[PDB]
Structure 1
Amino acid sequence: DFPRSRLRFKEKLGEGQFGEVHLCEVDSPLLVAVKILRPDATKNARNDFLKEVKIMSRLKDPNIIRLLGVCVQDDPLCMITDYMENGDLNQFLSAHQLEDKAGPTISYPMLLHVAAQIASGMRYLATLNFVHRDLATRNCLVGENFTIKIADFGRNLYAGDYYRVQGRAVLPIRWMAWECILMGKFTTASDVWAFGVTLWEVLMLCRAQPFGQLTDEQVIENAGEFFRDQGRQVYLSRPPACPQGLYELMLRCWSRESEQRPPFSQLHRFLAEDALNT
């Protein structure tokens, strides 16, 4: 149980619904991320905080954010993770351009490595029957040497990625499989569908929102068209950097039937091995 006395708050990194995240130095320089309660925290927030600790303490994988420590015994409450020095993957990738064979660059096999790491992380969450429910580049963190960690969740930079109706759950409908949109059904199989969208983002180098020229309402109609199965449904197009082989893998992630979507083990295998084929 970590002593908050050895923490030195340096920068504010972001706000959540019940917490804010700061950069801190640890005198024992060593940089960590510390999430604390927001200044307006009600006791509903406190509970959701203590519950996040419970949930997060499960998570032990190289490509999942890890809980390094807690100050929970006495206030103030805090959560400690590694500090991912390169911020979220959406931001990060947006700052790069695909490497030119003939601004900062990144290579196609590096895009695969980034995607593979997300897959390996999700392969891990699958073994825990843990359903993420909001997998997207914006919720992936980036450390040194293109290391990726999936975050447990989460705030205004990406407001347009969520569909909001008063009294309803805030929903990332553009990353959601049709059965989630239509039936509220969230499974590892729909995490697989959102991974296909996330892989699409990575290949787009986050240059465009999924279905970015369709309205929310049309995205929701598109879901119903997967359901009615009369071939009218539409898909994300193949990104410029994406070979047809990788794209068909993407399309498998958007099979109407949950069963026909690839498992993450296979997604990993492909990204780390097959994808390197000419």
Structure 2
Amino acid sequence: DFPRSRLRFKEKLGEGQFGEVHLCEVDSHPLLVAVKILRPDATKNARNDFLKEVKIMSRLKDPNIIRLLGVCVQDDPLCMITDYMENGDLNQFLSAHQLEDKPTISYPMLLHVAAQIASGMRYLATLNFVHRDLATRNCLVGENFTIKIADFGMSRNLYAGDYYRVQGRAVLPIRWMAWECILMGKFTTASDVWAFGVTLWEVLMLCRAQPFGQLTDEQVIENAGEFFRDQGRQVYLSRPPACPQGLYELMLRCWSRESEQRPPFSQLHRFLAEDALN
């Protein structure tokens, strides 16, 4: 439940939220899994966190969401078992690739990467599961360009500049957050839509520039205030080179001031799986 002695620890994949991730083998030999083990200096608070993350992840059962295939909690040290995504982090995976002239990635593949995120996000919406932190950095690539949405938290020093940090406040992925999250702390499905819009811009940017990169933290926060004000002073992410106008129009709708005028993930999937092909 699941037998801990069946796990064979092979490499360190990265750090992790409450300890390290290991690539493991299961003889059931190279049936590969990822194993997150609770750090050995891990405080009572991190253990609680780890156990909650276990419960949250047990809910998530979709091809395009990370799967908890197993757990080793019933004895110390605490362990979490997921699929292994061989290409790792989607932001770092895309960062290497260049758009196909006329590692490469083509435009229809960028659509397929996006549609897999639209599908997994559609799944979460049916659970009324609010992600709160959709971005390429929380996505994993397992090939054949198979995308799993995950959540690595907000503490890793690689993506430090992606979060806005105030002493004693919640850590805020502001460049991905809908105006109403920024001003009110209101995370919904509709704000997940907004972040998908930004994630979709990231994919189409091949993860080569930060959303509102040339703007400061403050400026992103006051841009949210420009959305509330509704005076036509709100500034949007520009069209990525790899992005047509038809598709960019869909990114824009994602950032509609009115949450209910943002497209449901069902429509974002229909667009990226069907309409973006024509």
TM value normalised by structure 1: 0.97
Deviation at 1:17, TM superposition (A): 3.4
Offset of residue 202 of structure 1: 0.2
Quick one: distance in 1 between partners of 2:203 and 2:161?
A: 18
Give the CA deviation at 1:266: 0.2
Alpha-carbon distance, 1:127 to partner: 0.4
Provide the secondary structure at the position in 2 that maps to 1:207. Answer: coil
1:222 corresponds in structure 2 to 223
Once the two structures are TM-superposed, the CA of residue 75 in structure 1 deviates from its matched residue by: 1.2
Distance 1:255 1:89 in 2: 26
Please give the alpha-carbon distance, in whole angstroms, between the structure 2 residues aligned to 1:160 and 1:10: 31
Shift of 1:265: 0.1
Q: 1:50 offset after TM fit, Å?
A: 1.0
Q: Secondary structure at the match of 2:200?
A: helix
49-58 vs 118-127, greater mean Cα deviation: 49-58
| Cα-Cα RMSD | 0.9
1: distance between equivalents of 2:263 and 2:19? 35
What is the deviation of 1:13? 1.7
Give me the whole-angstrom Cα distance separating, in 1, the residues matched to 2:16 and 2:201: 26
Q: How far apart are 1:153 and its partner, in Å?
A: 3.5
Cα offset for 1:221? 0.6
Contact 1:84/1:143 (8 A) holds in 2: yes
String of CA shifts for 1:138-165, please: whole Å, max 9, x gaps. Answer: 0000002010000034311111100001
Return the offset for 1:10.
1.7
* CA positional deviation for 1:204: 0.4
What's the CA shift string for 1:225-256, capped at 9, x where partnerless?
01111111100000000000000000000000
- Does 1:207 pair with 2:196? no
Q: Deviations over 1:55-84 (max 9, x none)?
A: 111110010001111111111211101100
SS of equivalent to 2:5:
helix
Mapped contact 1:19–1:49 kept (Cα < 8 A) = no
Query: Displacement of 1:169 after TM fit?
Result: 0.8
Preserved contact between residue 38 and residue 50 of structure 2 (Cα < 8 Å): yes
Aligned length: 275
Three-state SS of the structure 2 residue aligned to 1:51 is: helix
Counterpart of 1:265 in structure 2 is: 266
Give the CA deviation at 1:129: 0.5
2:58, 2:229 → 1: CA distance?
A: 41
Shift, 1:16, TM fit? 3.0
Report the Cα offset of residue 27 of structure 1. Answer: 2.5
Paired-residue identity, %:
100
The farther-off stretch of 233-242 and 28-37 is 28-37
Partner in structure 1 of residue 10 of structure 2? 10
1:139 alignment partner in structure 2: 138
Check the 8 A contact 2:16/2:152 in 1, yes or no: no
> 2:166 aligns to what SS in structure 1?
coil
Q: Runs of 5+ in structure 1 lacking a partner?
A: none
CA deviations 1:171-201 (Å, max 9, x no partner) are 1000000000001111000000000000000
3-state DSSP class of the match of 1:149? strand
1:33 and 1:85 mapped to 2: Cα distance? Answer: 10
Contiguous gaps of at least 5 residues in structure 2: none
Q: With structure 2 as the length reference, what TM-score do the two structures score?
A: 0.97
Counterpart CA distance in 1 for 2:17 and 2:269 is: 32
Deviates more, 1:51-60 or 1:130-139: 51-60
SS at match of 1:144: coil
